[PDB]
Amino acid sequence: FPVVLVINCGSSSIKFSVLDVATCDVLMAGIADGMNTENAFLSINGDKPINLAHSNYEDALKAIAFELEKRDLTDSVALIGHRIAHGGELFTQSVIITDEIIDNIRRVSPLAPLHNYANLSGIDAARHLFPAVRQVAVFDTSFHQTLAPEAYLYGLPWEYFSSLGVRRYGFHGTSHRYVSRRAYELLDLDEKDSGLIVAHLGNGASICAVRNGQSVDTSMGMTPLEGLMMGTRSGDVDFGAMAWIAKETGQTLSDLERVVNKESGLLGISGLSSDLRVLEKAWHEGHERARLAIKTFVHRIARHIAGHAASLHRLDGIIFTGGIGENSVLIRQLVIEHLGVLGLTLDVEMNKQPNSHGERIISANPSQVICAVIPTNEEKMIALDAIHLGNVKA
Amino acid sequence: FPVVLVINCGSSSIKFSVLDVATCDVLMAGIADGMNTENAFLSINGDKPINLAHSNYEDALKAIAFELEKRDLTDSVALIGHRIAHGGELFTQSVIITDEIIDNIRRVSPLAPLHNYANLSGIDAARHLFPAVRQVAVFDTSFHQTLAPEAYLYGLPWEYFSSLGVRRYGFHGTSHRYVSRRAYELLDLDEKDSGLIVAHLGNGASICAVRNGQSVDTSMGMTPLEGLMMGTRSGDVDFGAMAWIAKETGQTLSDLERVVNKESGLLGISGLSSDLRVLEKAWHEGHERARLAIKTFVHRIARHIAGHAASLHRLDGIIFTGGIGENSVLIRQLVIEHLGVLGLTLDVEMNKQPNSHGERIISANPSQVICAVIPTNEEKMIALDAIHLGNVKA
Ligand SMILES: Nc1nc2c(ncn2[C@@H]2O[C@H](COP(=O)(O)OP(=O)(O)O)[C@@H](O)[C@H]2O)c(=O)[nH]1
Ligand SMILES: Nc1nc2c(ncn2[C@@H]2O[C@H](COP(=O)(O)OP(=O)(O)O)[C@@H](O)[C@H]2O)c(=O)[nH]1
């Protein structure tokens, strides 16, 4: 009974999961939170929040390696999957990790300094503890590599693209890809002749246009700062407005960088929370700024959904996913009502259903476009890639 | 036979026109170019490029005042129309200029420092030379004041909006408004039940969604830097990408401000010209970067057209205007072909027609949405506002 170990090294954490190869079922999940801090705890499943003090990425992984051996799982680890934040232009698909792959991930790391060096630390650690185990890298960007130049270029001088590599990359690619594959079955569509819009809505949020199985447009840019308004992120913002702010406040690009990334979005407008559960209840209680944050959020989602549809020859479906897309009855309805121009009709009883109902249609029959909720599973997609690459001879 | 004198004080020029009240026909047009420079020439109609050296806004206007008297037009000047770049939140419509109006234009001037102080210089000058003449201010922003908060707010912290006034304003409002009024007649639409998209395409370019006669969305932001890629302007650009550029090049916000405004867009990508006539011929001759600049330009126009349509309940028409929208057979077709998702069908013979054919339908009959070209006349709209306000008792 072989298993896949899925690793996601964030800026301050290591989120891991163990999945069965035969069914893709999660057998163990955990998180090594508070990395590089004096208080670094590892909490597997919730059964025991074990503690460590000031420990590196490898030490937190060596803790997992001991825990897995304690539960007799070590010999079952047939494959290891690694989440990579940025694959530049070098990666278009998931690959078996080699010395070449590591060099190439290190080459593109300047495009995402914080996240990518953490991912490499995870690879180096996992390679030490599991040398006899095949290891696979899965990139957040690789799905959007099918974007045409007209879709990924910025209006900046050509020099910045050819010399410095400034262009759209986009993210949530593993989610967008997974949700796409699932949508073709649910909606009974031919992948080779299809047009989908996938709205990934969580703390970080992005839209993606999938034409004939390929990503043709996506809302995030070179960084996760572009596109939709998000939890703490502003989304699309007038650069002239940002420069105007600088003159008045004396703030720098870096100062405003943190503001746009960490203090804006739902949190920024409402002045209350980045969490939608909080804001939805706040609006029901007549909070004005929470209502506006949600309306702004919805308006910007609808605008980008309709905009991304232009990159399609025919619109067959709109798919909601992520913590917000899976669980928010309100946001989904508000977005769909804001897209009556595309001819969407909502089935409210179907939209009322909680996430326990899984992959489900939420649009009425006379709707010109099918609307659906499909729960994303980035861990499963990483595992399915690892399983597929497990048959390869390298 | 009364006339209206229309004035547009730019950053380095004073563009003026004289229109007949009864027909709105241009009887005289001119430009006082190279303002505040050692070489400042005033060229009326082209018949005589008269010259002046290092002269202020009032001196260039005092030149016009003498020229109009030389052609015996002074006594015919019944009304004067002033183009204002920015009306903040204080102006929602065209107003008869008073001491109150001047104070209020001076209040909103920090929102557009360069252009607005030039507009005030024009008012002060024209008031001196024509005190007995009613004078009207027409704002570039006033039409977009019907935008709902969800449409004009940025995802920035609320403080920046309430305290500093950072929000979407949008521009080309006089054009968008004029073209809208004209579209209702041409398309036989009821203004009170209608949905239009107006694509203003010139050196500076913007989209506007007009729902039931009111602007509900527009592509430009607080400044003309947001939205579409333009002649020298980048348009929408990832703020994270801009901050990333700063770290590598050592450039500041101001440095990148000039780049985004003056060195980007069509000029930036192609590395050839901001002029489309140049680039279209370059592409026909197989120039690769000119082809990409045009494709990027088209892609970003289509994306914003479809996006702005979300703010409508029903899409009746898409209207092209501006130097590019009126004259470019290629861009119009490429944009419309990129919007097949909305069900647009183009009539190529009709689209082939040059601007001499004026207000014209360019879409085929079985198209779900009507497409049209309507030549914009900002001077005429300013004059029509002045004429309307000429019946008022102040
Ligand atoms: N309305 C609603 N929103 C939810 C619910 N659960 C989660 N969310 C929202 O979804 C977000 C978390 O989604 P997630 O996909 O995990 O985002 P991530 O942290 O970037 O991975 C939270 O910040 C909430 O705003 C729910 O039950 N109802
Ligand atoms: N293809 C094409 N483009 C044109 C033509 N005339 C003007 N243009 C484009 O339109 C732009 C000028 O338009 P205009 O509305 O005057 O822009 P403005 O300078 O901001 O007022 C030029 O930069 C050209 O790119 C034409 O005959 N054909």
Tab-separated table of N, CA, C and O in Angstrom, chain A residues 110 149-151 153-158 160 164 166 217-218 222-223 225-226 229 234 237-242 244-245 251 259 263-265 268-269 289 292 295-296 299-300 302-303 306-312 338 341, chain B residues 110 149-151 153-158 160 164 166 217-218 222-223 225-226 229 234 237-242 244-245 251 259 263-265 268-269 289 292 295-296 299-300 302-303 306-312 338 341:
chain	number	residue	atom	x	y	z
A	110	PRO	N	14.895	34.348	-8.520
A	110	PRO	CA	14.766	35.805	-8.387
A	110	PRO	C	13.372	36.359	-8.715
A	110	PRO	O	13.040	37.466	-8.285
A	149	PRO	N	1.877	35.705	-26.332
A	149	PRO	CA	2.592	36.936	-25.974
A	149	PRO	C	1.685	38.141	-25.722
A	149	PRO	O	1.922	38.892	-24.775
A	150	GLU	N	0.652	38.303	-26.548
A	150	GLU	CA	-0.323	39.392	-26.398
A	150	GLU	C	-1.049	39.346	-25.049
A	150	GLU	O	-1.496	40.377	-24.540
A	151	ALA	N	-1.152	38.148	-24.479
A	151	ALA	CA	-1.819	37.948	-23.198
A	151	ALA	C	-0.882	38.091	-21.998
A	151	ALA	O	-1.337	38.408	-20.899
A	153	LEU	N	2.348	39.889	-22.133
A	153	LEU	CA	3.161	41.100	-22.172
A	153	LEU	C	2.494	42.255	-21.438
A	153	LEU	O	1.268	42.410	-21.473
A	154	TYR	N	3.318	43.048	-20.760
A	154	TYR	CA	2.897	44.339	-20.238
A	154	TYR	C	3.227	45.423	-21.255
A	154	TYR	O	4.118	45.251	-22.093
A	155	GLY	N	2.506	46.539	-21.172
A	155	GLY	CA	2.726	47.678	-22.056
A	155	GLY	C	4.027	48.412	-21.792
A	155	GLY	O	4.264	49.480	-22.354
A	156	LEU	N	4.867	47.835	-20.937
A	156	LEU	CA	6.180	48.390	-20.625
A	156	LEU	C	7.107	48.346	-21.845
A	156	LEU	O	6.855	47.584	-22.783
A	157	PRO	N	8.170	49.178	-21.847
A	157	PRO	CA	9.176	49.085	-22.905
A	157	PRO	C	9.721	47.667	-23.044
A	157	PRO	O	9.971	47.003	-22.037
A	158	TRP	N	9.887	47.225	-24.288
A	158	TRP	CA	10.314	45.860	-24.627
A	158	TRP	C	11.544	45.386	-23.851
A	158	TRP	O	11.662	44.197	-23.539
A	160	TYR	N	12.357	45.688	-20.768
A	160	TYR	CA	12.002	45.069	-19.485
A	160	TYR	C	11.583	43.605	-19.605
A	160	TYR	O	11.768	42.829	-18.667
A	164	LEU	N	14.997	41.739	-18.628
A	164	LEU	CA	14.713	41.475	-17.209
A	164	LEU	C	13.651	40.395	-16.948
A	164	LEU	O	13.490	39.941	-15.811
A	166	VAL	N	10.299	40.665	-17.340
A	166	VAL	CA	9.048	41.200	-16.815
A	166	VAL	C	7.901	40.858	-17.762
A	166	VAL	O	7.865	41.309	-18.912
A	217	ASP	N	-5.689	32.963	-20.579
A	217	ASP	CA	-5.627	34.214	-19.819
A	217	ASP	C	-5.728	33.895	-18.334
A	217	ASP	O	-6.384	32.925	-17.949
A	218	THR	N	-5.069	34.709	-17.511
A	218	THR	CA	-5.142	34.589	-16.053
A	218	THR	C	-4.937	35.961	-15.395
A	218	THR	O	-4.244	36.821	-15.947
A	222	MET	N	3.063	38.986	-12.894
A	222	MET	CA	4.397	38.534	-12.519
A	222	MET	C	4.392	38.119	-11.049
A	222	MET	O	5.047	37.149	-10.660
A	223	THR	N	3.645	38.870	-10.243
A	223	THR	CA	3.473	38.587	-8.823
A	223	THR	C	1.986	38.345	-8.534
A	223	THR	O	1.133	38.665	-9.368
A	225	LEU	N	0.117	40.075	-6.910
A	225	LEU	CA	-0.508	41.367	-6.583
A	225	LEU	C	-1.531	41.871	-7.612
A	225	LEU	O	-2.358	42.731	-7.295
A	226	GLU	N	-1.475	41.346	-8.836
A	226	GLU	CA	-2.337	41.830	-9.914
A	226	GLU	C	-3.658	41.072	-10.008
A	226	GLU	O	-3.735	39.889	-9.675
A	229	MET	N	-9.236	41.969	-6.373
A	229	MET	CA	-9.073	42.348	-4.977
A	229	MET	C	-9.134	41.062	-4.150
A	229	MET	O	-9.927	40.166	-4.451
A	234	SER	N	-4.716	44.416	-2.683
A	234	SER	CA	-5.555	45.404	-3.364
A	234	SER	C	-6.074	44.937	-4.721
A	234	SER	O	-7.200	45.264	-5.106
A	237	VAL	N	-4.450	48.159	-9.405
A	237	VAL	CA	-4.371	49.514	-8.869
A	237	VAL	C	-3.637	50.453	-9.838
A	237	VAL	O	-2.585	50.107	-10.390
A	238	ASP	N	-4.232	51.625	-10.055
A	238	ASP	CA	-3.673	52.667	-10.910
A	238	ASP	C	-2.274	53.046	-10.431
A	238	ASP	O	-2.093	53.478	-9.291
A	239	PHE	N	-1.285	52.866	-11.306
A	239	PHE	CA	0.105	53.184	-10.974
A	239	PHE	C	0.300	54.688	-10.792
A	239	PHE	O	1.133	55.120	-9.995
A	240	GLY	N	-0.475	55.473	-11.538
A	240	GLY	CA	-0.495	56.924	-11.381
A	240	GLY	C	-1.003	57.335	-10.014
A	240	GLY	O	-0.493	58.285	-9.418
A	241	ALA	N	-2.010	56.613	-9.523
A	241	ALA	CA	-2.565	56.845	-8.192
A	241	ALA	C	-1.541	56.512	-7.113
A	241	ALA	O	-1.440	57.220	-6.112
A	242	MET	N	-0.782	55.441	-7.336
A	242	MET	CA	0.261	55.009	-6.407
A	242	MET	C	1.408	56.009	-6.328
A	242	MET	O	1.955	56.246	-5.249
A	244	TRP	N	1.036	59.207	-7.066
A	244	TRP	CA	0.408	60.382	-6.466
A	244	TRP	C	0.411	60.279	-4.942
A	244	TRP	O	0.649	61.268	-4.245
A	245	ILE	N	0.139	59.074	-4.440
A	245	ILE	CA	0.165	58.788	-3.005
A	245	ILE	C	1.560	59.041	-2.430
A	245	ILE	O	1.694	59.634	-1.357
A	251	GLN	N	5.993	58.221	1.192
A	251	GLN	CA	6.245	56.780	1.160
A	251	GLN	C	7.001	56.356	-0.095
A	251	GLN	O	6.912	57.008	-1.138
A	259	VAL	N	1.881	47.730	1.913
A	259	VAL	CA	0.494	48.187	2.029
A	259	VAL	C	-0.422	47.434	1.055
A	259	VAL	O	-1.462	46.905	1.455
A	263	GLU	N	-1.994	44.994	3.793
A	263	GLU	CA	-2.918	45.871	4.523
A	263	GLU	C	-4.137	46.305	3.711
A	263	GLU	O	-4.965	47.079	4.193
A	264	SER	N	-4.248	45.794	2.489
A	264	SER	CA	-5.286	46.225	1.557
A	264	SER	C	-6.411	45.190	1.427
A	264	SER	O	-6.653	44.407	2.348
A	265	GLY	N	-7.097	45.207	0.287
A	265	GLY	CA	-8.151	44.244	-0.020
A	265	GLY	C	-9.367	44.341	0.878
A	265	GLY	O	-9.769	45.435	1.280
A	268	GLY	N	-8.437	45.919	4.029
A	268	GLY	CA	-8.196	47.342	3.815
A	268	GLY	C	-9.443	48.201	3.774
A	268	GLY	O	-9.510	49.229	4.452
A	269	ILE	N	-10.429	47.785	2.979
A	269	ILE	CA	-11.662	48.562	2.816
A	269	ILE	C	-12.546	48.499	4.066
A	269	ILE	O	-12.926	49.539	4.609
A	289	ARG	N	-18.997	49.523	5.782
A	289	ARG	CA	-17.701	49.298	5.140
A	289	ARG	C	-17.455	47.834	4.770
A	289	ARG	O	-16.711	47.545	3.832
A	292	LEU	N	-19.436	47.357	1.506
A	292	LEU	CA	-18.715	47.946	0.382
A	292	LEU	C	-17.537	47.078	-0.051
A	292	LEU	O	-17.309	46.894	-1.247
A	295	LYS	N	-19.063	44.234	-1.966
A	295	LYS	CA	-19.557	44.718	-3.258
A	295	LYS	C	-18.416	45.029	-4.238
A	295	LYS	O	-18.499	44.682	-5.420
A	296	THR	N	-17.357	45.665	-3.734
A	296	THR	CA	-16.143	45.941	-4.511
A	296	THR	C	-15.475	44.639	-4.964
A	296	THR	O	-15.083	44.499	-6.128
A	299	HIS	N	-17.702	43.056	-7.592
A	299	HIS	CA	-17.641	43.841	-8.826
A	299	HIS	C	-16.367	43.548	-9.611
A	299	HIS	O	-16.402	43.414	-10.834
A	300	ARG	N	-15.248	43.455	-8.898
A	300	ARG	CA	-13.957	43.186	-9.529
A	300	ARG	C	-13.820	41.735	-10.005
A	300	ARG	O	-13.132	41.472	-10.989
A	302	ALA	N	-16.514	39.953	-11.132
A	302	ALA	CA	-17.385	39.919	-12.307
A	302	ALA	C	-16.705	40.535	-13.526
A	302	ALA	O	-16.819	40.025	-14.642
A	303	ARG	N	-15.996	41.632	-13.293
A	303	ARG	CA	-15.308	42.363	-14.340
A	303	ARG	C	-14.229	41.492	-14.977
A	303	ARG	O	-14.132	41.415	-16.202
A	306	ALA	N	-15.824	38.310	-16.947
A	306	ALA	CA	-16.299	38.720	-18.268
A	306	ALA	C	-15.145	39.079	-19.203
A	306	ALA	O	-15.170	38.739	-20.385
A	307	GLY	N	-14.137	39.759	-18.664
A	307	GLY	CA	-12.937	40.107	-19.419
A	307	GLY	C	-12.147	38.909	-19.920
A	307	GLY	O	-11.744	38.868	-21.085
A	308	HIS	N	-11.929	37.934	-19.040
A	308	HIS	CA	-11.232	36.695	-19.394
A	308	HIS	C	-11.986	35.866	-20.430
A	308	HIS	O	-11.373	35.097	-21.175
A	309	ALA	N	-13.308	36.027	-20.475
A	309	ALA	CA	-14.150	35.312	-21.436
A	309	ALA	C	-13.867	35.717	-22.888
A	309	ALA	O	-14.135	34.946	-23.815
A	310	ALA	N	-13.324	36.919	-23.074
A	310	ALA	CA	-12.952	37.420	-24.398
A	310	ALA	C	-11.894	36.540	-25.074
A	310	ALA	O	-11.847	36.452	-26.299
A	311	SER	N	-11.061	35.887	-24.263
A	311	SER	CA	-10.029	34.977	-24.763
A	311	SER	C	-10.577	33.602	-25.162
A	311	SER	O	-9.813	32.714	-25.537
A	312	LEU	N	-11.896	33.434	-25.087
A	312	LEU	CA	-12.548	32.189	-25.487
A	312	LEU	C	-13.311	32.372	-26.790
A	312	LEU	O	-13.738	33.481	-27.112
A	338	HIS	N	-24.358	39.733	-11.143
A	338	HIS	CA	-23.569	40.776	-11.800
A	338	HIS	C	-23.142	40.370	-13.220
A	338	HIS	O	-22.562	41.171	-13.947
A	341	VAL	N	-25.486	39.817	-18.062
A	341	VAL	CA	-25.133	40.200	-19.430
A	341	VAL	C	-24.648	39.006	-20.266
A	341	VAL	O	-24.829	38.983	-21.482
B	110	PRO	N	-5.126	69.633	-7.134
B	110	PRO	CA	-4.094	68.667	-6.733
B	110	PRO	C	-4.264	67.262	-7.329
B	110	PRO	O	-3.294	66.502	-7.383
B	149	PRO	N	-19.829	53.190	-5.713
B	149	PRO	CA	-18.604	53.014	-4.923
B	149	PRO	C	-17.822	51.742	-5.249
B	149	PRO	O	-16.594	51.789	-5.330
B	150	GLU	N	-18.530	50.632	-5.453
B	150	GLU	CA	-17.912	49.349	-5.814
B	150	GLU	C	-17.129	49.427	-7.129
B	150	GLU	O	-16.178	48.670	-7.340
B	151	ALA	N	-17.534	50.347	-8.000
B	151	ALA	CA	-16.890	50.535	-9.294
B	151	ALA	C	-15.731	51.533	-9.255
B	151	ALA	O	-14.830	51.459	-10.090
B	153	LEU	N	-13.944	52.465	-6.154
B	153	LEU	CA	-12.996	52.212	-5.073
B	153	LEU	C	-11.848	51.319	-5.523
B	153	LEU	O	-12.034	50.395	-6.323
B	154	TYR	N	-10.659	51.621	-5.011
B	154	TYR	CA	-9.521	50.721	-5.108
B	154	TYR	C	-9.464	49.847	-3.863
B	154	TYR	O	-9.988	50.219	-2.808
B	155	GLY	N	-8.821	48.689	-3.992
B	155	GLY	CA	-8.656	47.759	-2.881
B	155	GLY	C	-7.701	48.253	-1.810
B	155	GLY	O	-7.347	47.506	-0.899
B	156	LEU	N	-7.287	49.512	-1.924
B	156	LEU	CA	-6.414	50.148	-0.943
B	156	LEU	C	-7.119	50.311	0.408
B	156	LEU	O	-8.352	50.266	0.468
B	157	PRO	N	-6.342	50.481	1.498
B	157	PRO	CA	-6.948	50.792	2.793
B	157	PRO	C	-7.867	52.006	2.710
B	157	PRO	O	-7.529	52.990	2.051
B	158	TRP	N	-9.018	51.912	3.371
B	158	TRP	CA	-10.072	52.936	3.340
B	158	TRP	C	-9.563	54.356	3.591
B	158	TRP	O	-10.100	55.318	3.032
B	160	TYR	N	-6.973	55.906	2.521
B	160	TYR	CA	-6.537	56.569	1.286
B	160	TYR	C	-7.682	57.182	0.482
B	160	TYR	O	-7.482	58.168	-0.229
B	164	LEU	N	-7.479	61.016	1.643
B	164	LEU	CA	-6.695	61.553	0.520
B	164	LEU	C	-7.450	61.643	-0.816
B	164	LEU	O	-6.968	62.272	-1.763
B	166	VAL	N	-8.275	59.101	-2.893
B	166	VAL	CA	-7.813	58.137	-3.885
B	166	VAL	C	-8.967	57.226	-4.299
B	166	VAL	O	-9.502	56.464	-3.486
B	217	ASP	N	-19.138	52.191	-15.531
B	217	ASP	CA	-17.751	51.728	-15.434
B	217	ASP	C	-16.917	52.446	-16.485
B	217	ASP	O	-17.422	52.785	-17.557
B	218	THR	N	-15.645	52.683	-16.167
B	218	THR	CA	-14.693	53.282	-17.105
B	218	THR	C	-13.268	52.796	-16.799
B	218	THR	O	-12.947	52.488	-15.647
B	222	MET	N	-7.748	57.129	-11.306
B	222	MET	CA	-7.491	58.447	-10.740
B	222	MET	C	-6.710	59.284	-11.752
B	222	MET	O	-6.931	60.490	-11.884
B	223	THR	N	-5.795	58.624	-12.458
B	223	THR	CA	-4.999	59.247	-13.509
B	223	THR	C	-5.272	58.531	-14.839
B	223	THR	O	-5.843	57.436	-14.846
B	225	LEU	N	-3.363	56.823	-16.439
B	225	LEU	CA	-2.408	55.710	-16.571
B	225	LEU	C	-3.035	54.309	-16.518
B	225	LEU	O	-2.415	53.336	-16.958
B	226	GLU	N	-4.248	54.204	-15.978
B	226	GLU	CA	-4.888	52.902	-15.789
B	226	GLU	C	-5.743	52.477	-16.980
B	226	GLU	O	-6.302	53.314	-17.689
B	229	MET	N	-3.738	49.635	-22.728
B	229	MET	CA	-2.449	50.046	-23.265
B	229	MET	C	-2.719	51.152	-24.288
B	229	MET	O	-3.698	51.084	-25.035
B	234	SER	N	1.505	52.501	-20.646
B	234	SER	CA	1.488	51.047	-20.471
B	234	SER	C	0.093	50.473	-20.246
B	234	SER	O	-0.210	49.368	-20.705
B	237	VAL	N	-0.793	47.652	-15.125
B	237	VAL	CA	0.505	47.047	-14.847
B	237	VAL	C	0.588	46.552	-13.395
B	237	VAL	O	0.189	47.254	-12.456
B	238	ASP	N	1.080	45.324	-13.239
B	238	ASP	CA	1.275	44.693	-11.938
B	238	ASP	C	2.171	45.562	-11.060
B	238	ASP	O	3.314	45.851	-11.417
B	239	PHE	N	1.636	45.989	-9.917
B	239	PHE	CA	2.384	46.834	-8.985
B	239	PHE	C	3.551	46.072	-8.361
B	239	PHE	O	4.589	46.658	-8.052
B	240	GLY	N	3.368	44.765	-8.182
B	240	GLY	CA	4.435	43.885	-7.719
B	240	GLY	C	5.581	43.820	-8.710
B	240	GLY	O	6.746	43.783	-8.314
B	241	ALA	N	5.239	43.808	-9.998
B	241	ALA	CA	6.229	43.814	-11.071
B	241	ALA	C	7.005	45.125	-11.087
B	241	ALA	O	8.214	45.131	-11.313
B	242	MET	N	6.300	46.226	-10.832
B	242	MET	CA	6.906	47.556	-10.786
B	242	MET	C	7.871	47.705	-9.616
B	242	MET	O	8.921	48.337	-9.751
B	244	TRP	N	9.376	45.123	-8.209
B	244	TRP	CA	10.448	44.190	-8.545
B	244	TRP	C	11.476	44.854	-9.460
B	244	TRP	O	12.682	44.651	-9.303
B	245	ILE	N	10.982	45.642	-10.415
B	245	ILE	CA	11.829	46.404	-11.333
B	245	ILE	C	12.710	47.389	-10.563
B	245	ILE	O	13.901	47.517	-10.852
B	251	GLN	N	15.724	52.262	-9.781
B	251	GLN	CA	14.802	53.337	-10.145
B	251	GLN	C	13.783	53.619	-9.047
B	251	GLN	O	13.446	52.735	-8.255
B	259	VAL	N	8.419	56.540	-17.253
B	259	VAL	CA	8.506	55.375	-18.137
B	259	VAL	C	7.111	54.870	-18.530
B	259	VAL	O	6.825	54.677	-19.714
B	263	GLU	N	7.126	56.464	-22.188
B	263	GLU	CA	8.032	55.576	-22.929
B	263	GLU	C	7.473	54.175	-23.169
B	263	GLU	O	8.153	53.320	-23.738
B	264	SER	N	6.233	53.951	-22.746
B	264	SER	CA	5.625	52.624	-22.786
B	264	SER	C	4.606	52.492	-23.925
B	264	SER	O	4.697	53.193	-24.935
B	265	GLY	N	3.649	51.581	-23.756
B	265	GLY	CA	2.565	51.381	-24.712
B	265	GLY	C	3.013	50.866	-26.065
B	265	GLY	O	3.938	50.057	-26.157
B	268	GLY	N	6.521	51.703	-26.592
B	268	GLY	CA	7.360	50.867	-25.739
B	268	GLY	C	7.630	49.476	-26.276
B	268	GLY	O	8.783	49.039	-26.313
B	269	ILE	N	6.572	48.780	-26.690
B	269	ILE	CA	6.703	47.404	-27.178
B	269	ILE	C	7.369	47.348	-28.557
B	269	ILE	O	8.365	46.643	-28.736
B	289	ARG	N	7.891	43.097	-33.779
B	289	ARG	CA	7.560	43.847	-32.566
B	289	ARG	C	6.379	44.802	-32.750
B	289	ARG	O	5.673	45.113	-31.789
B	292	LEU	N	3.291	42.522	-32.482
B	292	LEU	CA	3.028	42.182	-31.087
B	292	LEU	C	2.396	43.347	-30.331
B	292	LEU	O	1.465	43.148	-29.551
B	295	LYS	N	-1.189	43.410	-31.438
B	295	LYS	CA	-1.903	42.268	-30.860
B	295	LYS	C	-2.156	42.440	-29.356
B	295	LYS	O	-3.253	42.145	-28.871
B	296	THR	N	-1.145	42.931	-28.636
B	296	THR	CA	-1.260	43.253	-27.209
B	296	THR	C	-2.302	44.351	-26.977
B	296	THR	O	-3.147	44.245	-26.081
B	299	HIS	N	-5.717	42.864	-27.685
B	299	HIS	CA	-6.072	41.920	-26.625
B	299	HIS	C	-6.555	42.643	-25.372
B	299	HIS	O	-7.530	42.227	-24.746
B	300	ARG	N	-5.864	43.721	-25.014
B	300	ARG	CA	-6.217	44.501	-23.829
B	300	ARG	C	-7.489	45.333	-24.024
B	300	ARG	O	-8.222	45.572	-23.066
B	302	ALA	N	-10.057	44.252	-26.009
B	302	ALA	CA	-11.112	43.238	-25.973
B	302	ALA	C	-11.434	42.817	-24.542
B	302	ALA	O	-12.598	42.631	-24.181
B	303	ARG	N	-10.388	42.675	-23.738
B	303	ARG	CA	-10.509	42.252	-22.355
B	303	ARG	C	-11.310	43.275	-21.554
B	303	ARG	O	-12.220	42.909	-20.809
B	306	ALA	N	-15.174	43.486	-22.811
B	306	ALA	CA	-15.954	42.393	-22.232
B	306	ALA	C	-16.140	42.561	-20.724
B	306	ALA	O	-17.219	42.300	-20.195
B	307	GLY	N	-15.086	43.003	-20.045
B	307	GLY	CA	-15.140	43.279	-18.611
B	307	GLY	C	-16.122	44.372	-18.225
B	307	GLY	O	-16.900	44.209	-17.281
B	308	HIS	N	-16.088	45.484	-18.955
B	308	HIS	CA	-17.011	46.600	-18.735
B	308	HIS	C	-18.467	46.227	-19.005
B	308	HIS	O	-19.378	46.833	-18.437
B	309	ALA	N	-18.677	45.232	-19.866
B	309	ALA	CA	-20.022	44.757	-20.199
B	309	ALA	C	-20.737	44.117	-19.002
B	309	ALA	O	-21.970	44.070	-18.963
B	310	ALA	N	-19.958	43.634	-18.034
B	310	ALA	CA	-20.498	43.041	-16.810
B	310	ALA	C	-21.337	44.040	-16.005
B	310	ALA	O	-22.266	43.649	-15.300
B	311	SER	N	-21.007	45.326	-16.129
B	311	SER	CA	-21.747	46.396	-15.455
B	311	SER	C	-23.060	46.758	-16.156
B	311	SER	O	-23.753	47.685	-15.739
B	312	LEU	N	-23.402	46.022	-17.213
B	312	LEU	CA	-24.653	46.232	-17.939
B	312	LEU	C	-25.632	45.100	-17.666
B	312	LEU	O	-25.223	43.982	-17.354
B	338	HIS	N	-11.899	39.201	-31.725
B	338	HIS	CA	-11.512	38.798	-30.372
B	338	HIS	C	-12.709	38.785	-29.408
B	338	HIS	O	-12.577	38.372	-28.259
B	341	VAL	N	-17.058	35.696	-28.523
B	341	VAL	CA	-17.712	35.149	-27.333
B	341	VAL	C	-18.998	35.908	-26.971
B	341	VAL	O	-19.926	35.327	-26.410
